[model samples]
Target: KTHVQLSLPVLQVRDVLVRGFGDSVEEVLSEARQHLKDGTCGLVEVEKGVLPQLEQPYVFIKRSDAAPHGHVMVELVAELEGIQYGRSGETLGVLVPHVGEIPVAYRKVLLRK
Candidate 1:
C-alpha cells in the first residue's frame, strides 16, 4: 500500500460544535452563514448515533499551504489561523444552551505548508 500524507488545517479547529449542522456541508455553510454574521445557528444531526453531538470542523487549508508569508492572503491566513478554535461555523450542543460558550481558539501554530 502507498502512504499518502494528508495535511490538516494550519490550525486545529476543535470544540466548536457542529451537531446542529444539517449532517452535510450545507450544515456547516448554514451555520457559518448565521454565526459569521448573525451569530445564531448550529449543526443539527440528521442520522442517529450522531445527534446532539459536538460536531467539530476539520478545516483543511489547502491553498494557504503553498502560500508564502508575503502572499496577499498571508494576513488572511494568519487571521484564519487565529480562528484555530474560534467559531467558524455555528455552535450547537447542550453546552450551547446553558453555558453559552464563546467560540475560542484552542490551538495555534505555523508549520511548513
Candidate 2:
C-alpha cells in the first residue's frame, strides 16, 4: 500500500449534524472547487442535521502549518481530512430548534483546488 502526502482541508464535524453534504469528501470539495471564487472561498448552504443548528460561520481557522513570514508557492490539491470534533454551522446534538439553515464557508488555503 502507498499513500501520498497531501495538503488540504480537514473537516471537523459533530457526528451526524451536517446535512446536504456528500458522504464522500471529494464530492463536497468538488462543489467548493467548481464554484470557488477569487477569494479562494466557496459558500455552501445546507440544512443542519437532526432538526436545527447554527446559522452563521464561526471563524476562519488559521493554518498552524503556515509561517508568519513566507512567500513560497505551493500546489493546490483537492483533499480532505476528517475531524470529529467541531463543524461550522452545526450545533450540539439534542434535537433542538434553531435557524435550521447553515452557511459553510470554505477557506482559501485549506481546500486549495
Candidate 3:
C-alpha cells in the first residue's frame, strides 16, 4: 500500500453560531472570535494545503443554516500562499440562499481578469 498525505484546514470556527443565540453578521463574527485559542482565525491553513494535483480538489463546508429551520448566511475566506493572482471557476463566488456561498476578495491587488 502507498501512503498519501492529505492537508486539511485548521479552522477555529470564528463566526459560525446557532440560531436564537445571535442573529447578526457582527454577532457571528464576534462569537467566532471568542473561540480563538491560537493566533489563527477561521480556516487558517495558509500553507500545507496547496499541492501539485492533476485533478483539482475542492474544499467546502456543509452547514444546516438554511432550509425552513435555518438562520443567517454563511461565508468563508481561504488565504493561499505563493498566489500573487489566482482564480477558481469551481467554487469561487457566492452560492446563494440555503446551501453556501463564498465571496472572494483580495487586497494590494484589485481588478479582475
Candidate 4:
C-alpha cells in the first residue's frame, strides 16, 4: 500500500471544498477546527465507494511546515504481501478519456481564481 505525509503552510483545511460530478453537489469542511497556525499532519486514502459510481471517493487529514502551494511526503510500504495474482493492477496503464476537458464545476471554481 502507499502512505503519505504532508506539511501545509496555511491551515486552510477550512477552505477546502468538495464537488461531486454525479450529484453536481458541493460541500465544505465545516466539521473540523481550522484556525491552526502550527499546521497539522496525517494520512489520506482513496477508498472504495460510498455513493453512486460517479461519486469518486476521497480521504484526507491535516499536515505541517511547508509551501502554501502544497507538498507531499510519502513512503510506499509493501508486502505485495497477501496480494493475490488476479487482484492487482500491476503495471497496467490506465487510460483516461477527454484529457483536455475540465468539468463545469471545476471551471466555475477556477475561473474566479
User: Could you tell me the lDDT of residue 93 within candidate 1?
Assistant: 19
Error of 2 at 33 (Å): 1.2
The lDDT of model 1 is: 0.27
Largest TM-score belongs to which candidate? Answer: 1
Of candidate 1, the 10-residue stretch with the lowest lDDT total is: 72-81
Candidate 1 wrong stretches, greater than 4 Å: 1-20, 41-53, 56-99, 102-113
Per-residue lDDT of candidate 4, residues 26-97 (tens digit): 211111112111122111222344222222321122221222233332111111123211222221110111
Candidate 2 segments exceeding 4 Å error:
1-21, 37-111
Question: Which candidate gets the maximum lDDT versus the true structure?
Answer: 2
What tens digits encode model 3's per-residue C-alpha lDDT throughout 1-113?
12111112232222212111123434433443332222222232122332222011212222212322222222332222332122232222211111122213211111110
Ranking by lDDT: 2, 1, 3, 4
Candidate 3 structure, TM-score to reference: 0.19
**Candidates in descending TM-score order:** 1, 2, 3, 4
Residue by residue across 6-112, what tens digits does model 2's lDDT show?
22222223332343223344554443333232222222222355223322212222222332123111222222342322233222111101123332322233222
Please provide TM-scores, in order, for all candidate models, with all chains considered together: 0.26, 0.25, 0.19, 0.17
- TM-score-superior candidate, 2 or 4: 2
Worst 10 residues of 2 by lDDT: 90-99
- Cα lDDT, model 4, residue 59: 17
